[PDB]
Amino acid sequence: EIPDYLCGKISFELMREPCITPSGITYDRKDIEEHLQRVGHFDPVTRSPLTQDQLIPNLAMKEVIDAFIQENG
Amino acid sequence: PDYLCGKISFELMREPCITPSGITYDRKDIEEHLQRVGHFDPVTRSPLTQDQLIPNLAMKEVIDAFIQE
Amino acid sequence: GAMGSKALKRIHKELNDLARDPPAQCSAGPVGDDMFHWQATIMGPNDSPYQGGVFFLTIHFPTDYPFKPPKVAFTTRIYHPNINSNGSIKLDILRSQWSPALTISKVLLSICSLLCDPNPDDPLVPEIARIYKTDREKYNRIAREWTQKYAM
Ligand SMILES: [Cl-]
Ligand SMILES: [Cl-]
């Protein structure tokens, strides 16, 4: 079973390319990019204004997630 | 696990902080660095200031579960 | 990000309020292009042995400001039971009694109060606190000598 901080706030699945917003919130890249294009330019959780270019790769989470794969699925 | 450890402290972090370069440091270390070494990222060397530091809330949840082990 | 921008807008707001209504004997503001790093000036209060001296302080705001206190230290040497040779200030507002409703203006007022009225019973420098409590004539003498040697 998966922990929650590994799963996407939007995707509800294991994150594959985690980005973190200026609020400190981490999303899977495709899902947050799809939210920004279809819903609006705001953080799904904090609601503060958000654009695609402000997403930051959460590099430490990417290796946390990779280590989960290397243990199970 | 090297990834729970800071890129300055080289120790497990209590307050993970990420930079626009996407590198996570323990807060005290990165802030001391910015205030008294220079306004730059110690690993990428790109320009960085205190207000660009972003709490790495996901990484904090990781450390919390490892502590309970 | 959100947090840093929030801190910046509040530091900015506190700077503006302070320049619009300066204290007569004090000042504080960013040293250059860095809003998180200020310098302050305190005139030694008349009716105290710091009379006539000028004291400079550095202020570093945290990224969590206003939800963490600023870091404040003297860069001018001063003889005081709650201020040490590194310039560190033992003062409640800067430690356990911080509130996000307080401001740098209130930090400066509190430090001035501290210079007029030490807290020797909770000392940072115990020997100075002892001379303060047991021999105020000597404390005043040495404090004025330090004011003349280091702040005039
Ligand atoms: Cl997501
Ligand atoms: Cl670090």
Measured at the CA of C109, the angle between CA C19 and CA C107, to 5 degrees, comes to 80
Q: If you ran DSSP here, which 8-state letter would residue C102 be given?
A: -
Chain A nearest-CA residue for C5 = A22
CB proximity list for C111: less than 8 A, separation 6 or greater = C42, C57, C72, C89, C91
Q: Residue C120 corresponds to which tokens in the numbers above? A: 């020797």
Cis omega (within 30 of 0) for bond into C66:
yes
Among the bound ligands, the one closest to the CA of B16: 2
**At what resolution in Å was this solved?**
2.0
- Total domain count for chain C? 1
List the single residue in A4, A20, A67 with the smallest CB-CB distance to B56.
A20
Distance CA C39, CA B54 (A): 26
Burial C86-101 (b: 16+ CB within 10 A, else e): ebbbbbebbeeebeee
CB B28 within 8 A of CB B15: yes
Identify the CATH class of B2-67.
Answer: alpha beta
List the single residue in B27, B39, B50 with the smallest CB-CB distance to C4.
B50
Q: What is the DSSP string of C56-85?
A: EEEEE--TTTTSSPPEEEESS---BTTB-T
Q: Residue A55 corresponds to which tokens in the numbers above? A: 């997403």
CB B62 within 8 A of CB A64: yes
Distance CA B13, CA C4 (A): 20
We report the CATH number of the domain holding residue C145 as 3.10.110.10
The residue range of the domain holding C130 is 2-150
Distance CA A11, CA A2 (A): 13
Contacts of A23 in chain C (CB under 8 A): 1-2
Contacts of A4 in chain B (CB under 8 A): 61
Q: How was it solved? A: X-ray
Distance CA C28, CA C56 (A): 9
Contact B54 A24 (CB under 8 A): yes
A4-69: CATH, from 3.40.50.10540, 2.60.120.260, 3.30.40.10, 3.40.50.720: 3.30.40.10
Q: What are phi and psi of C62, to 5 degrees?
A: -80, 165
Measured at the CA of B35, the angle between CA B51 and CA A26, to 5 degrees, comes to 35
